[PDB]
A paper describes a structure:
To catalyze the RNA synthesis in both replication and transcription, L sequentially consists of five domains: the RNA-dependent RNA polymerase domain (RdRp), polyribonucleotidyl transferase domain (PRNTase), connector domain (CD), methyltransferase domain (MTase), and C-terminal domain (CTD).
In both conformations, parallel P tetramers are revealed around MuV L, which, together with structures of other nsNSVs, demonstrates the diverse origins of the L-binding X domain of P. Our study links varying structures of nsNSV polymerase complexes with genome replication and transcription and points to a sliding model for polymerase complexes to advance along the RNA templates. In cryo-EM maps, four P molecules assemble like a kettle spout stably anchored to L. Our cryo-EM structures capture the clear interface between two P molecules (depicted as P1 and P4, respectively) and L, involving the RdRp, POD, PLinker2, and PCTD regions.
Residue numbers in the entry:
A (entry chain B): 218 to 286
B (entry chain E): 216 to 273
C (entry chain D): 218 to 277
D (entry chain C): 214 to 304
Write the structure that this text describes.
Amino acid sequence: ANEIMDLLRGMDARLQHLEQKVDKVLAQGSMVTQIKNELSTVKTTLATIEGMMATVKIMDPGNPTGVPV
Amino acid sequence: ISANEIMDLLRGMDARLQHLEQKVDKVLAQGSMVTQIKNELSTVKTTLATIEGMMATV
Amino acid sequence: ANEIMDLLRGMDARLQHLEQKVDKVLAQGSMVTQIKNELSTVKTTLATIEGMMATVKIMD
Amino acid sequence: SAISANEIMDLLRGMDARLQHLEQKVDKVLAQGSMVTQIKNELSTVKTTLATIEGMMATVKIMDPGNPTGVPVDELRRSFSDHVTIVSGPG
């Protein structure tokens, strides 16, 4: 009779910390979002470096400049 | 009498499971975000690999 | 009563569905491993780049 | 009530097992956020060093030696004679 109710509260309790463990992982996305925001700046600085290298490469006078189309 | 309290606790169980469902769906969404960051960072890596070469010739 | 236990047969069926779905959520392990590998690679390759940058020669 | 008894048996023991797998799953995924914040720090270091190399690259010297010794043009032609299609900037 009452034993089943006892184990029932036991289940409620178990699930209650299921929430906690999950609450933690949901809160783990904080970096994921920031790292995306800052990776945007990493991307633009990378692109600038790549463009500078392309420009210096084509600045050599041995091989003349050929524009696509 | 007890069956009424049991009804309430089991209904609360259902609600708790719905909460877990939503939270873990948000976890799947975070996973979609991390996969986007995956492909984009791979593109960044490939670009950096492409530039290391000119480093010497120039 | 009986109605409640039928509601729990439905609800824990939803529970088996929940665990089935989070089985897919488990997949990001090797995923984060891969992303760690790529960025570490990025770090190593930019190491070479900064290494060759500091030099006495002037670019021609 | 015995029928209800084994019905309970099935409904409870089962969900208990499922929750056991569930707690094993979260136990396995708890390290993902930690390794993520590591990747965060290293990524910040990468951003810092990429920024400083951009800083050094903002100031570079490009020098053309020319023909100082006056060596003949005959061997001096070390250049490709054809237009080469290399994409620069946009493309």
